[PDB]
């Protein structure tokens, strides 16, 4: 329950963005390595208590699921929630860390720009790579 | 006899107006243990004009066509109107429904003028059958106006719907539209 001190409103855990107003399946999803079915499988394989709440969370719990995100090969599950899966720069599913160095961090997008990949050109805009018949098309990519 | 458990009774309804004997059918054999038993009033030669108040509440609330799909929901909301108004008032829900809709609602409701009218309305002596039925309609649409699309916690929205429909708070939009209708009715006077 709440105690007469600071609630876990705004803190820097893993440089992610989350505010304590939306409930479960949304708070865990705020970190790009936790949420939905992957959260289900992690909570299963780690044998975790259902009652635990994220309202006053501990950093270790999110970190451990993130470590599982880095290395899900042993678990025999899709290493999903990664934009870097089977992509250049990782010999094996590796975790890149830190922010403010996005160009270096996501150099995958720089590799896609230097090869001028239309697929890569898709990222940065909201549109279909296939491009459907002339109609409400093109509107995909509004800034 | 037939009653509600060992704690509630349903034989406490006597208005004695001698005017609800031509449209509200209680005369001879229209009694039901059942709140609703799959009526076929459509196939009948307009034999649906002797309809009681509970079925009006049953059939006059849904917005658009976004509730139909299972009359399960209709009968369930009849049952839960029963129980929720019973919880609100501590007595027979239908009795207090009538009590709290008669003391308010349409005194002279919306009805046109002569052969064609849309500019203003006419302060019309509302017939007891149509006054009661349209007051239940007011409560139903106010329930789907207040309980639905509410900015507050919904377990007292029937209490505030009763407040808006009878006491006259400036919360429900239907009650201010009816206020404009009453302003026209007084324009007639």
């Amino acid at each position: 329950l709440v105690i007469p001190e600071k609630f876990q409103h705004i803190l820097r855990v893993l440089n992610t963005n989350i505010d304590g107003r939306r409930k479960i399946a949304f708070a865990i999803t705020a970190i790009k390595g936790v949420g939905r079915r992957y959260a289900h499988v992690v909570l299963r394989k780690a044998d975790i208590d259902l009652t635990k709440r994220a309202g006053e969370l501990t950093e270790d719990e999110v970190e451990r699921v993130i470590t599982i995100m880095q290395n899900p090969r042993q678990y025999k599950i899709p290493d999903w929630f990664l934009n870097r899966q089977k992509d250049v720069k990782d010999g094996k599913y590796s975790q890149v860390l830190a922010n403010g160095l996005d160009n270096k961090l996501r150099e995958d997008l720089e590799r896609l720009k230097k090869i001028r990949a239309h697929r890569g050109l898709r990222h940065f805009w909201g549109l279909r790579v296939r491009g459907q018949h002339t109609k409400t098309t093109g509107r995909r990519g509004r800034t | 006899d037939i009653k509600l458990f060992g704690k509630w009774s349903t034989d406490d309804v006597q208005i004695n107006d001698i005017s609800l004997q031509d449209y509200i059918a209680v005369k001879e054999k229209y009694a039901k243990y059942l709140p609703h038993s799959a009526g076929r009033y459509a196939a009948k030669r307009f034999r649906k004009a002797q309809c009681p108040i509970v079925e009006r509440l049953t059939n006059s609330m849904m917005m658009h066509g976004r509730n139909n799909g299972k009359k399960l929901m209709t009968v369930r909301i009849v049952k839960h109107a029963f129980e929720i108004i019973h919880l609100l008032t501590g007595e027979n829900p239908l009795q207090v429904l009538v009590n709290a809709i008669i003391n308010s609602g349409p005194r002279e409701d919306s009805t046109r003028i002569g052969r064609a009218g849309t500019v203003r309305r006419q302060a019309v002596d509302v017939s007891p059958l149509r006054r009661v039925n349209q007051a239940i309609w007011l409560l139903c649409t106010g329930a789907r106006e207040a309980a639905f699309r509410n900015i507050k916690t919904i377990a007292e929205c029937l209490a505030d719907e009763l407040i808006n429909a009878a006491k006259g708070s400036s919360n429900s939009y239907a009650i201010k539209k009816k206020d404009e209708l009453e302003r026209v009715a007084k324009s007639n006077r």
């Binding site: 089977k86 250049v88 720069k89 010999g91 090869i115 697929r119 | -």
Partner: protein, 126 residues
């Protein structure tokens, strides 16, 4: 700088071992036309490959060769030869980097382009 790695999977390490076990790990797509067998209906592609790699080594635009085949891929030695569409109306000449193994967008040559768009104004309703 950075060389070519096969989509996060090592390539020089791939060539470290033998060659008979690479077909068991052959990449996705661009093998169907010759999937009927490493037999007839294939000699033309290898003939053009020898043609181009004799007139132009890798990392170079080839000499008058216009093959329309996807050039079933095993290694980024495909550079040094160009997939081109020949009609008298289609002529693409682009030097493409050797990062193409069984994967996306190794072909910049395009057989169509938008046609002259006229004036969109001059009224819209009457």
């Amino acid at each position: 700088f950075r060389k070519f790695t096969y989509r996060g999977v090592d390539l020089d390490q791939l060539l470290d071992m033998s060659y008979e076990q690479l077909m068991q790990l052959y990449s996705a797509r661009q093998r169907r036309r010759l999937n009927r067998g490493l037999r007839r209906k294939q000699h033309s592609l290898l003939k053009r490959l020898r043609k181009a790699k004799k007139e132009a080594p890798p990392m170079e635009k080839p000499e008058v060769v216009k093959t329309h085949l996807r050039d079933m891929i095993i290694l980024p030695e495909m550079v040094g030869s160009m997939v081109g569409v020949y009609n008298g109306k289609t002529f693409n000449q682009v030097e493409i980097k050797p990062e193409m193994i069984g994967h996306y967008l190794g072909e910049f040559s395009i057989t169509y382009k938008p046609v002259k768009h006229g004036r969109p104004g001059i009224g819209a309703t009457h």
